[PDB]
Amino acid sequence: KVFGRCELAAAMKRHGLDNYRGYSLGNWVCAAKFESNFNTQATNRNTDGSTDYGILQIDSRWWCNDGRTPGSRNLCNIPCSALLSSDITASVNCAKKIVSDGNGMNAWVAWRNRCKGTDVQAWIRGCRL
């Protein structure tokens, strides 16, 4: 599924991401627009072999198992396809462990380069929240 902007905002707040580890909802909404364009089914292959899965592009080198990233970890304890669902629970669940792992949202390259230090509040503009 491709989320609407306020639709995704609503469902992320529902799932506890607004101000999770200090980061406002705007940050997360901005992270998703640049990582996946709000597409839950988004996939991207990396040079090292790993693949980035879903609306928040979680990488199989570190967080999920895709059965073809040999010698990698599965720290969220899920199969990577779990992250491609229309329901974002799994991705948001795993996202909370990523952002707590020491580097904050810097783990998300598009956030560091396109959302960080910008008016991220503007991504939740007009949303009935």
Ligand X SMILES: CC(=O)N[C@@H]1[C@@H](O)[C@H](O[C@@H]2O[C@H](CO)[C@@H](O[C@@H]3O[C@H](CO)[C@@H](O)[C@H](O)[C@H]3NC(C)=O)[C@H](O)[C@H]2NC(C)=O)[C@@H](CO)O[C@H]1O
- Which residue, chain included where needed, has tokens 């959302």? 115
Instruction: Please give the backbone phi and psi of residue 76, each rounded to the nearest 5 degrees, phi first.
Output: -90, -5
Q: Please tell me which residue in 7, 18, 35, 59 is annotated as part of the active site.
A: 35
Q: Which residues of 27-62 are buried (b: 16+ CB within 10 A; e: fewer)?
A: bbbbbbbebbebebebbeeeeeebbbbbbbbbbbbb
**For tokens 């506890």, what's the residue?**
16
- Indicate the residue among 58 and 84 with the shorter CB distance to ligand X: 58
Query: Does 123 sit near ligand X (CB under 6 A)?
Result: no
Please pick, from the candidates 18, 20, 29, 61, the single residue that binds ligand X as defined by CB under 6 A.
61
Is residue 23 involved in binding ligand X (CB under 6 A)?
no
**62 contacts ligand X (rule: CB under 6 A):** yes
Q: Is 18 annotated as a binding residue?
A: no
What is the binding site for ligand X (CB under 6 A)? 52, 57-59, 61-63, 98, 101-103, 107-108
Binding site as annotated, residues for substrate? 101
